[PDB]
Write a protein of this length. Structure first.
Lengths: 104, 426, 102, 428, 426, 427
């Protein structure tokens, strides 16, 4: 028996990215905005970021710290940081991130 | 615009063509009642290359079936997409060649080839601009070999300046279905080297090996083998039917692949091929397609590509892709395996990109190589032919019908000088 | 795949900051949009804002010899301050004409 | 002042697809073809009321991309009579494109360009777009150039041709096609602008770090280069040049016309936000080999004449200072017999971005067109790979059966060798 | 960036690798289905060193399991995290070696090594910046020692510039699991002494002693021993996967630990190992870690290190720690125990610190020692080798497959000279 | 006026991480990179309200580099400057100078050249490195080679972290260090020696911190660099730029290896404790307990000393303090140099970093001097280097990379000539 059905959806490159340039670029760059440069390469990370995107203060410290919790959705998180993982760079720049979030 | 008409010869050719037409109809969104039910406008654009509109949305394939036994016609009519064909392209004899090349080329041909030429003419100047003919057949049988090759000779005489693709499945000693396979094959290829424009070489052993290793199937039936071949046919003709970033039609494929007029037997393969278990553990990238493309275990011929050198190669790609990645992927694979490529030709790989992959996939590809490894297969059949001709075994069925020993002698000479030319250029 | 035409990495992306959808990313040759320095240094090869034209410095106004820079004229000034300037100088003009001119 | 554009082949008309979108964005014309509320006069002729049709002809043998454009949203811009479509491709065969199928469509092409020129008034010259690697762009392009030269002769023909890259390639007989193209490209067109593919690939990988660039990015960048070239005609500037100053200043000898191109600053949004942008460093960026449209090493050659177009907020003082610094720098050496080897130009309108593009809007930009001998090295490199295939007579039989022979191959090879000697002689 | 590909050889190697991938998956936060669900993006940041992304975040390990018996593969698939391996990478024979070095290195190798090389070549070319390979196996079995050893030799031939780790478990007379242990181990180390870049030596007797005394487990099954070995692997490879104050990669550790080219056999230990009863009462400090680190009975080999001198030592610390504390502890332990360290090398200890400890712990440490104590074990095995070889007992099962006498004599000679040079530098 | 910075190695770029944080705090530039002329010596102003540093981070292992890239200072350093490699040199000088060298130094120079083109009054280069490792040693020496051959006449200040006598973490760091010196002797113009164990002693005795990490050491080094550059950055009563350093501190072209010290190394409670004035801080900046390199200056004679005072300082009392120092007999100078002091005064006091261990003080002193303690350090290193070289240990790695024995012998004899040079000069 033949396969049930498969819809035709693929468009040509000319119709795709030199005629719908604005929506194409909008969607492409909306896929990955909050991810870090060394982190964006992974599709799992991209999906995690999209679901995460789907408190203003907490957002401020998150965007100031940068690489803290971009793909989060056992170990409970404390008010300042996570028990298991605490990098030296974060320990050094905690105060700078705090003041940057305060200014934001 | 560009036109391709199809001819189906013999039992194997008829089944392969039936599967091919099913696949093409699914791709173009026409249901087996001959009516259109596609969704995207991209399907309407190039349905004149394979179909004709009759009346009220009825699309009929541009194909001609030709055989000698009602069993094949009944089998292709019973199955799905069997009622879309054309009853007057159902041109048809009654006796049966009985796996005899002399019977297929001299006895029943003399009374069916007039009719098949009349119908193929009618359909050929029914259209405006022919691009090529497309005939699918075997090289071991009786009906598809002899009558098919005489049809090729007639078409070459009547239209000299059109492309012609002949999709030929070839025999092997390991899979011998008839005892006169080298006898039929030698004469068929003797006619092909002088009349055919280019042939796609296929064989059952490599298809079974693929279904064993890569597909990991347990029951690789003839339907499955014909489905693989039909997918390859759709892949090679995809450029004429869909737009791409770098278009490559049949004639430029020929001029890029063929360096010398006699070297037009090409080995072909398809990607991606993954099992149901391993489809979830695999990526879909240009390097991922390339490593499978250039694998020897992906090949659908019983000839080791690493046993010789590649004269030329071509890679058709389907999907939205990075032309840069394609270019440096071919460049890197050529630089790495430098010994296996010919030296006096730089840039041995011609790559093309199209924007429409097959339905349900993300990225697909077809590989067409013109290498010198097929001289092994030609020696393989030549030794068998000499061994049986040494004492004229099984020969009187040809001699008593009109065949003479001279034709066998010229066929042997052609095989010898062809493999000599392969060895010379290797 | 997502990275088919773009970079998509945060360091080299083409998406500008949300504050300004369109702004000329570069350094203007006039440097008007800079806080004017408290005391100009001896050697500065770049100008700031409203410098007099070569023709106007060649054919100067009269107060330039007294020491009033050309910019003091075009500088915006308030009602009371300009009224006091008018009174302190010998304009001797009435309130109606003053309101008309203002 | 007007100039007309003809696009021959897949690459040429795709570059034109990018170019005309960029031009419409620059001049404020919606794709329907009307202006909501005279600079456009060089490209668009206003027909009747509320319409603007481009001065362009796309013509090609295969109909795929042409009717793709027909079915696209730029249907109201180009009406379907300028779009000239054949029936069967030249199939990457110079002989087929110049002898078999060319003879039928070239007459109609001439008959359309004739009325285009007739409708025009102050025609400056022609500009052609093609890649010599293929069949149509090689054969039909050469034939069309020959017919246009015998028709007009005294009008300059700006040919923006794409040669095949040294290591990156997609065809097999493109050395043959390129040699046969150069045979007439040397002696018919007046100014030939060279382009490659892998050089732009490396540019997008280095500056724009697009690890997976498609042809559209390259076409957009080439379109920006052409726009920078034409900005002097289209808008007024502080120091402006038409196409005639190029023809005079940029060529020292009647045969030496092969110009390298460069653009700056090819940069993204936050990178541009990061870097302080001025005249000196963009002039510096315009001269290293890491920013040239063609992969060649200028360090092995000596410059002969260079021209620098500037767009946006640029004064003459700082560009004069930058040119002085470049002249004092010792890494790049001009030829002795040219004391003044620099020609600048400045225009008041900055480059315009295309929405969805990979470039950010910038106060000022620079386009370089220069002469050197690395072009001669490129030609010799192509000649060697031509000769290697030609020694074994590979693929000759296709051309022979088409109707062409061995004599023109011999003549083209010796012509390329003569050009090599000419470059080596002029370099001394 | 840096890329490590895993190879598991034989039954013990397969089980050890299964536990290794369980613990690594737990560390990186990917479930036994292959989908990420972890807590910090520092896990994502360096998953590429061990995993490949197939479809929609389906991360698969870059490991090849290779053996000659289906039972091990069946057990691997039955266990949890056994569904994350790519089914294509299960390269696998059918007949079995049967604790025969000749069968594993000359007979079954001829049909399995080509396939394993093909798969490993695919997996190594799939990566961008190759760092090294890591192979887990034994020296007493047949299909684990000889076959994996030939694999190592072929790999070293193909990639003479890349990193290589050999995790080898070795036997002892007290626990003699097979009868041909010296006959196998002598040849295995004979090939390793020139093939592998470094081999880290394990044994079951030391693991049993550790579990009995320090861990006080009642029934230390093979699972616990494999867990200890996997934890050591994670410790030795944590520097690439997580940042720290002072990073040391595999090449850095090799150049720090190996003074002379032939001296590349190490003994390793892990800390802290605390009994479950005494876990609550015991402090966590750098001296706390160092005290259990330098416990001579905490080593994982039956070569009591105080019977010789230390050539080099290396300590990989994990957790938030004080560098002054770390290097002062190293200085103290090196100054007080002057006689146990080599005299012509000042500062015999190399330390490195990573900020990310193993899950569930605060501070951990992996100790790697390159000392002269292993000459005792090598003499201990060579003596049994000579004793068995004296009557040529069991030798005909090896000679009747391709071996002669001179290979055994050369193996004995190389053991003798290697132990002699340990004695010289001692 | 401007001076540009290059940070080589995992240690160097962490020192730079401290340095640029301190600079941004001192100039009031937020981590995002924008303020809400003095900055012109370190930051170039781009766009509208944005300043970018004149620095280049370079290293081979990407872990620390992209740690910096994705940390809090993502906006400050834009990724066109943060050069990153593919694989580490594995503490192998041969690997970092001969194998990985030629594929990254070209990019480093091609970026530094256009930074130099952007800057106008370039004072010089300052490089941060540690000679113990391979990347900091090998390609650092290569970078010095190529910067010297490209400019020559421009000043280069190399701040180098030398290995300590006893407290050590590497094994082949003697080989790496001597291979570094063979080029650092002849190429860098002002080399400043730093040690880890000496700073450990300083932080244990003064800040009474019992568990110090690399962060405090880097913070103190950054404070030293800022104190040394503040004279160029800000106006003062008696201000001193890059050039007098070379003029006054380098008696002979082959003797440029300077010791450093800083005071007051004090905490908040101890700043509450003690009165900090010029006399006592000058006294504190001369005992070996506050030397940044573990060596005894009493064993040697001071060739020349340079004293920077920051904050509320006046010429009278600094002259009184230097007079007292000269009259004190405990430290003895060289006869051929009767006047061996170079003073400098700056008005803006040292700034503090939130979370730092130092307290804000009225004034501070940074001392940089020449002696023969460095000469005895070199002999101490050479002894343990030849101890290893006697057995040809670890040489196989270098020779397999492509190095050989002739240049090992050349480095050994060059350092012998150097120690003889200090011995002859000190008399
Ligand atoms: N820059 C750029 N080059 C292209 C593009 N498409 C094709 N090319 C180049 O064009 C060369 C060959 O010419 P084609 O564009 O394929 O078309 P053609 O010249 O008309 O030749 P035919 O296709 O046989 O008719 C190739 O080597 C490509 O490098 C494109 O979109 N952008
Ligand atoms: N002062 C200080 N020194 C450091 C720091 N980190 C590392 N070091 C020193 O750096 C020396 C070794 O160099 P590495 O840290 O490995 O960096 P490298 O020189 O590039 O060597 P590679 O590992 O080959 O990259 C050690 O001896 C340490 O003393 C730090 O944060 N501060
Ligand atoms: N792939 C494929 N091959 C077939 C099929 N049927 C027959 N063949 C091949 O065709 C060859 C013989 O051709 P034959 O049936 O004698 O052609 P005939 O003369 O028309 O009867 C055999 O070697 C078969 O391998 C089919 O359904 N699929
Ligand atoms: N640590 C550990 N060692 C094992 C395990 N299974 C077997 N071994 C060791 O493997 C050695 C025997 O190797 P063998 O299984 O014969 O290797 P083979 O040739 O692959 O079958 C014995 O000395 C065991 O100590 C296991 O699960 N864990
Ligand atoms: Mg074309
Ligand atoms: Mg390092």
């Amino acid at each position: 028996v033949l396969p049930p059905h498969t819809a035709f959806t693929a468009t040509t490159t000319y119709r795709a990215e030199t005629l719908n340039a604005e929506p194409n670029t909008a969607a492409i760059l909306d896929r990955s905005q909050g991810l870090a440069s060394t982190l964006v390469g992974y599709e799992a990370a991209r999906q995690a970021g999209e679901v995460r995107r789907s408190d203003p203060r907490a957002r401020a410290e998150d965007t100031a710290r940068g690489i803290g919790t971009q793909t989060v959705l056992t170990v409970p998180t404390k008010y300042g940081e996570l028990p298991g993982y605490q990098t030296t760079y974060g320990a050094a720049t905690d105060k700078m991130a705090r003041m940057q979030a305060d200014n934001e | 615009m560009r036109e391709i008409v199809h001819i189906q010869g013999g039992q194997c050719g008829n089944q392969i063509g039936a599967k091919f037409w099913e696949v093409v109809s699914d791709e173009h969104g026409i249901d087996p009642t001959g009516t259109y039910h596609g969704d995207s406008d991209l399907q309407l654009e190039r349905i004149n290359v394979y179909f004709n509109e009759a009346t009220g949305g009825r699309y009929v394939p541009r194909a001609i079936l030709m055989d000698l036994e009602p069993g094949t016609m009944d089998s292709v009519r019973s199955g799905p997409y069997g009622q879309i064909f054309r009853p007057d392209n159902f041109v048809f004899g009654q006796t049966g060649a009985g796996n005899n090349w002399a019977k297929g080329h001299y006895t029943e041909g003399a009374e069916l080839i007039d009719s098949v030429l009349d119908v193929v003419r009618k359909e050929a100047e029914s259209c405006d601009c022919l691009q090529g003919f497309q005939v699918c057949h075997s090289l071991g049988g009786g009906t598809g070999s002899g009558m098919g090759t005489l049809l090729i000779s007639k078409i070459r005489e009547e239209y000299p300046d059109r492309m012609m693709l002949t999709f030929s499945v070839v025999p092997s000693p390991k899979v011998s279905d008839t005892v006169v396979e080298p006898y039929n094959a030698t004469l068929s290829v003797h006619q092909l080297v002088e009349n055919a424009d280019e042939c796609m070489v296929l064989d059952n052993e490599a298809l079974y090996d693929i279904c064993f290793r890569t597909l990991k199937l347990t029951t690789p039936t003839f339907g499955d083998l014909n489905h693989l071949i039909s997918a390859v046919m759709s892949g090679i003709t995809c450029c004429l039917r869909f737009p791409g970033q770098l278009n490559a039609d049949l004639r430029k494929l020929a001029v890029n692949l063929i360096p010398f007029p006699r070297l037009h037997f090409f080995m072909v393969g398809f990607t991606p091929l993954t099992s149901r278990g391993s489809q979830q553990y695999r990526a879909l990238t240009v390097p991922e397609l390339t490593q499978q493309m250039w694998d020897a275990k992906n090949m659908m011929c019983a000839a080791d590509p690493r046993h010789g050198r590649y004269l030329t190669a071509s890679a058709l790609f389907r999907g939205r892709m990075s032309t840069k990645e394609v270019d440096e992927q071919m460049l890197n694979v050529q630089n790495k395996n430098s010994s296996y490529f010919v030296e006096w030709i730089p840039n041995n790989v011609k790559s093309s990109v199209c924007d429409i992959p097959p339905k349900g996939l993300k990225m697909s590809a077809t590989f067409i190589g013109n290498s010198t490894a097929i001289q092994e297969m030609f020696k393989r059949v030549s030794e068998q032919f000499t061994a049986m001709f040494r004492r004229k075994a099984f020969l009187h069925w040809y001699t008593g019908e009109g065949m003479d020993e001279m034709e066998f002698t010229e066929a042997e000479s052609n095989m010898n000088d062809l493999v000599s030319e392969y060895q010379q250029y290797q | 795949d997502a990275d088919l035409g773009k970079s998509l990495r945060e360091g080299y992306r083409n998406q500008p900051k949300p504050g300004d959808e369109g702004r000329a990313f570069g350094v203007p040759t006039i440097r008007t949009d800079v806080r004017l320095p408290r005391l100009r240094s001896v050697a500065n090869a770049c100008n700031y804002g409203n410098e007099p034209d070569a023709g106007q410095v060649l054919r100067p106004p009269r107060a330039a010899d007294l020491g009033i820079s050309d910019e003091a004229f075009v500088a915006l000034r308030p009602k009371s301050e300009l009224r006091q300037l008018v009174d302190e100088a010998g304009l001797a003009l009435s309130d109606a004409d003053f309101e008309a001119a203002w | 002042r007007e100039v007309i554009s003809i696009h021959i082949g897949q690459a040429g008309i795709q570059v034109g697809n990018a170019c005309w979108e960029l031009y419409c964005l620059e001049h404020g014309i919606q794709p329907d073809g009307q202006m909501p509320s005279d600079a456009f006069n060089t490209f668009f002729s206003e027909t009747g009321a509320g319409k603007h049709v481009p001065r362009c002809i796309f013509l090609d043998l295969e109909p795929t991309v042409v009717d793709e454009v027909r079915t696209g949203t730029y249907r109201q811009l180009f009406h379907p009579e300028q779009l000239i479509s054949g029936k069967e491709d030249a199939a990457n065969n110079f002989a087929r494109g110049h002898y078999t199928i060319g003879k039928e469509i070239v007459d109609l092409a001439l008959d359309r360009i004739r009325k285009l020129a007739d409708n025009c008034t102050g025609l400056q010259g022609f500009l052609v777009f093609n890649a010599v690697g293929g069949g149509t762009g090689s054969g039909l392009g050469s034939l069309l150039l020959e017919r246009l030269s015998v028709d007009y002769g005294k009008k300059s023909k700006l040919g923006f041709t794409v040669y095949p890259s040294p290591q990156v390639s997609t065809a097999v007989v493109e050395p043959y096609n390129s040699v046969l193209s150069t045979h007439s490209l040397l002696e018919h067109t007046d100014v030939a602008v060279m382009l490659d593919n892998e050089a732009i690939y490396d540019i997008c990988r280095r500056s724009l770090d697009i690890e997976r660039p498609t042809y559209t990015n390259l076409n957009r960048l080439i379109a920006q280069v052409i726009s920078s070239l034409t900005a002097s005609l289209r808008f007024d500037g502080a120091l402006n040049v038409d196409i005639t100053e190029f023809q005079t200043n940029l060529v020292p000898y009647p045969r030496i016309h092969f110009m390298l191109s460069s653009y700056a600053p090819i940069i993204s949004a936050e990178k541009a936000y990061h870097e302080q942008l001025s005249v000196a460093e963009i002039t510096n960026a315009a001269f290293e080999p890491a920013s040239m449209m063609v992969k060649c090493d200028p360090r092995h050659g000596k410059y002969m004449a260079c021209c620098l177009m500037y767009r946006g907020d640029v004064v003459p003082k700082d560009v004069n200072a930058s040119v002085a610094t470049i002249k004092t720098k010792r890494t790049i050496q001009f030829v002795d017999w040219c004391p003044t080897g620099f020609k600048c130009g400045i225009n008041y309108q900055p480059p315009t971005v295309v929405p969805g593009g990979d470039l950010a809007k910038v106060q000022r930009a620079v386009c370089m067109i220069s002469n050197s001998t690395a072009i001669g090295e490129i030609f010799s490199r192509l000649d060697h790979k031509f000769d290697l295939m030609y020694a074994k007579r590979a693929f000759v039989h296709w051309y022979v059966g088409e109707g062409m022979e061995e004599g023109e191959f011999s003549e083209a090879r010796e012509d390329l060798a003569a050009l090599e000697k000419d470059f080596e002689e002029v370099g001394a």
